[PDB]
Amino acid sequence: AALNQALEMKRQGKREKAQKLFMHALKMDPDFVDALTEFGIFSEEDKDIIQADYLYTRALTISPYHEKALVNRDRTLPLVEEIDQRYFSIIDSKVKKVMSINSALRRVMEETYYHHIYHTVAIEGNTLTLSEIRHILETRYAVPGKSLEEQNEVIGMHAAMKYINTTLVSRIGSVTISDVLEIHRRVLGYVDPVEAGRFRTTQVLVGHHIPPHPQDVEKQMQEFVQWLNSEEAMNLHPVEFAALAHYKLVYIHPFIDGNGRTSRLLMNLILMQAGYPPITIRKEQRSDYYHVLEAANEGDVRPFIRFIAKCTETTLDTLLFAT
Amino acid sequence: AALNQALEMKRQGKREKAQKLFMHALKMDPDFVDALTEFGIFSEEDKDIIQADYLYTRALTISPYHEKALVNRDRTLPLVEEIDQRYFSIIDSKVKKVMSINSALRRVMEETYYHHIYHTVAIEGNTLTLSEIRHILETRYAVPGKSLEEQNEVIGMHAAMKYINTTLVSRIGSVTISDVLEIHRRVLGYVDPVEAGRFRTTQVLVGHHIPPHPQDVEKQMQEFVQWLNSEEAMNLHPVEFAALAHYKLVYIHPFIDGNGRTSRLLMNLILMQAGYPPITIRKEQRSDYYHVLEAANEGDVRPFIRFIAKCTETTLDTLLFAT
Ligand SMILES: Nc1ncnc2c1ncn2[C@@H]1O[C@H](COP(=O)(O)OP(=O)(O)OP(=O)(O)O)[C@@H](O)[C@H]1O
Ligand SMILES: Nc1ncnc2c1ncn2[C@@H]1O[C@H](COP(=O)(O)OP(=O)(O)OP(=O)(O)O)[C@@H](O)[C@H]1O
Ligand SMILES: [Mg+2]
Ligand SMILES: [Mg+2]
């Protein structure tokens, strides 16, 4: 297809021109094996070995025996594993520095509380500002010309995270299905008290993902909590356990609304219990956030794990520069 | 005591002076038999036979064999029964006229919806106005400079009564404990989603009334729903069944908050299922309302039945301005 032109353009000059020809054949056919491999070898020329590996891994899900994809994948498979371990070791060092401090830190922890709420509600379309959120939570008075539902989403997030820190973070034992339901009972209670802390009774759609049928959610959630308390999950890096825990819940999509908000809270329950600070996926990252969750449905969870790992590093880089 | 002066003042002139004089010995001792009886004879001179009968009935709970109380009560007792039946027959006739009408009536039914909400919340101290309530429910936008809890009280009342008319009024069958919990789940859900639709876990005080202990609320409520579906309750006048239904739920006091709001809604479920319109206890009546409930704890529930009967007549008188 236009892949033949992408190669011709790349053959002597035209790097930025060739980049668009590759994406065009990818838009016109996202399972075009030859375009994925070639794009893979192309992005490796710009030192983007992680993207190249995604492309060879993607091309081998379509055609498992493709010789040009296999030869490059076998090389890059262990290299990307090393590259990803190194990033998690950087994150571990920044967590040591942050967990080796106080009063100057307390001013950041207070600022991040409202800033967390602001992004977790804004990532779903809530129009309230940080200043309007501070008013709602400090004063307990309503903000003019903004809906009551938007302001109740804020009261719920505050209540949910107050319950987690009060009842769940410093608790000894296994995470139950009832703990997930208690978080959701507060996240959504002030908005929809009938559905809050109760599973989906209907079948829905999330982008292009069709989650399990309501008849299967309870069996799928008992399998999820087993996994949270499983020895395999305890041996994973806390950043990887937190990201997978988020993805599996958001995959199950057990509630009508508040699944991303609950998942983002559960994700932070994990991190905090492992000594990491709570992280925040900013409202500007919705496009990336949704792309890497879609990528995980397609077959590759790694881009979402790296997405969470970059979110944790920016959180740690905020606590370290304000010290 | 000062009862001897109350009698001396009444003996030749001083009617208004002996009234405050009679109430002093009642404040100084509310179980003073002679005082109650003299007072009963006294209030009967002003043609207040219902109050006199309350006083002789009160005096005979203290001293069952008091000859002056017995002679006067054996007389008032069937007379008050006749007087109370006559009022319930007036109410029955006004209900026929109201249920024999349209467009001029529809103008009142819409106005009374926001009016019941305004009074059911205002009676508990809610500062929102009728105009602010119309905005909250019509627009779904918050009212400036008024708390979010006050506005969530309104969203809950609306949701609760929307559920009753939609799911309970025109339903065939027995009233269950779950129907009471579903009304309370909406009444309080937007304010307190953790306690909404859930019984009291602690022992509380309501004025001077100590309701049942949390261990006994479930047994006390199963006895309460049995009575709602009992043949004895079906044979009572709907005004008397509605008033007793209210008093029994509020005596039990099964929830931490929202008991009076739920009881007033249940009271109107009863009336509406019997063809009566929904009634509204106005915010100005909180003092009387609580006095008659205090009297029902003290032994006589007739003053509360008459209170509800006067509330139903004012509701019917309003609807009858259409003819
Ligand atoms: N393709 C996908 N597969 C699975 N989950 C997805 C996918 N795309 C998005 N999601 C997740 O679904 C969430 C949206 O679900 P939901 O409306 O129930 O809750 P939410 O708390 O309002 O989330 P948000 O505030 O981000 O919109 C997103 O936040 C995201 O985490
Ligand atoms: N002495 C009393 N004995 C029994 N019940 C009482 C007494 N005084 C008040 N009550 C009832 O208890 C209710 C108050 O309880 P509660 O706070 O749980 O409910 P509420 O919905 O907030 O009612 P309110 O709007 O009157 O404050 C009153 O509405 C009344 O019906
Ligand atoms: Mg949503
Ligand atoms: Mg109250």
Give contacts of A152 with chain B, Cβ < 8 Å.
148, 152, 190
State the SS3 of B153-176: HHHHHHHHHHHHHHHHCCCCCCCC
**Beta-carbon neighbour count of residue B131 at 10 Å?**
11
Could you tell me if the CB of B277 is within 6 A of ligand 2?
no
Cα A23 to chain centroid, rounded: 24
Based on the fold, state whether residues A143 and A235 are members of the same structural domain.
yes
Helix (H) or strand (E) holding A101: none
- Whether B259 contacts B250, CB under 8 Å: yes
The number of distinct structural domains making up chain A is 2
B81 and B93 belong to one structural domain:
no
- B264 vs B286: CA distance, rounded Å: 13
Query: Residue B265's beta-bridge partner residues?
Result: none
Q: Are residues A46 and A92 in the same domain?
A: no
Question: Do B176 and B104 share a domain, yes or no?
Answer: yes
Question: Helix (H, G, I), strand (E, B), or coil: what is residue B268?
Answer: helix
Sign of CA dihedral A310, A312, A315, A319: negative
Which CA distances in Å does B211 have to A71, A74, B168, B185, B188? 78, 74, 27, 21, 20
Rounded to whole angstroms, how far apart are CA atoms A97 and B269?
64
> How many Å apart are CA B210 and CA B223, to the nearest integer?
19
**Phi, psi (rounded to 5 degrees) for A206:** -125, 100
Instruction: Give the amino acid at A38.
Output: E
DSSP three-state, residue B231 = helix
- A92 and A80 assigned to the same domain: no
Q: In degrees rounded to 5, what are phi and psi of residue B222? A: -70, -35
CB contact under 8 A, A142 and B140: no
Q: Name the DSSP class of A190.
A: T
Q: Within chain A, how many helices (H) and strands (E) appear?
A: 15, 0
Method: X-ray
Q: How far is the CA of A258 from the centre of ligand 1 (A)?
A: 8
- Number of other residues whose CB lies within 10 A of the CB of residue B203: 11
Ligand 2, atom 14, residue with closest C-alpha:
B260
As a whole number of angstroms, the distance between CA B205 and CA B256 comes to 10
**Of B54, B85, B116, which one is at a domain's C-terminal end?**
B85
User: d(Cα B209, Cα A220) in Å, to the nearest integer?
Assistant: 48
How many CB contacts within 8 angstroms connect chain A with chain B? 71
Q: Which of B58, B85, B112 is the last residue of a domain?
A: B85
Residues B279 and B252 grouped into a single domain = yes
Which one of A146, A148, A196 has the shortest CB-CB distance to B151? A148
Residues B164 and B308 in one domain: yes
CB-nearest to B193 from A136, A145, A185 is A185
Nearest by Cα to A32 from A21, A45, A47, A18: A21
Interface test with A, best of B146, B190, B192, B257 (most A CBs within 10 A): B190
Same domain (yes/no): A74, A99: no
In whole angstroms, how far apart are CA A147 and each of A129, A133, B280?
13, 13, 29
Suggest the residue from B126, B148, B155, B188 to mutate for an interface test with chain A (most A CBs closer than 10 A). Answer: B148
My answer on whether B57 and B114 are in the same domain is no
The verdict on whether residue B184 carries a ligand-binding annotation is: no
* C-alpha of residue A213 to centroid of ligand 3, in Å: 19
Note whether B68 and B156 are same-domain residues: no
- Residue B253 a catalytic site member: yes
Chain B: which residues have CB within 8 Å of chain A? 136, 140-149, 151-152, 155-156, 159, 185-186, 189-191, 193-194, 196-197
The ligand placed nearest to the CA atom of residue B118 is: 2
**Phi, psi angles (nearest 5°) of residue A100:** -160, 50
The answer to whether B148 touches B190, Cβ cutoff 8 Å, is no
Q: What is the CATH number of the domain that holds B49?
A: 1.25.40.10
Both A309 and A262 in one domain: the answer is yes
A293-316 in b/e burial notation, b at 16+ Cβ within 10 A? Answer: bebbbeebbbbbbbbbbbbbbebb
Instruction: Identify the CATH number of the domain in which residue B317 sits.
Output: 1.10.3290.10
Asked if B303 and B220 count as a contact pair (C-beta separation under 8 A), the reply is no
Provide the domain limits for residue B57.
1-85
B170–chain A nearest CA distance, Å: 21
Q: How far is the C-alpha of A196 from the C-alpha of A181, rounded, in Å?
A: 8
Mutate to test the pocket of ligand 1, among A280, A290, A291, A297 (most ligand atoms within 8 A of CB): A290
Contact present, B6 and B22 (Cβ < 8 Å): yes
User: CB distance B193–A194 less than 8 Å?
Assistant: no
Please answer yes or no on whether B155 and A136 come within 8 Å at the CB atom. no
**Which of B53, B85, B117 is the endpoint of a domain?**
B85
Of B142, B159, B197, Cβ closest to residue A148: B142
| Cα B33 to Cα B58: distance, rounded to the nearest angstrom | 8
> B203 with B254, same domain?
yes
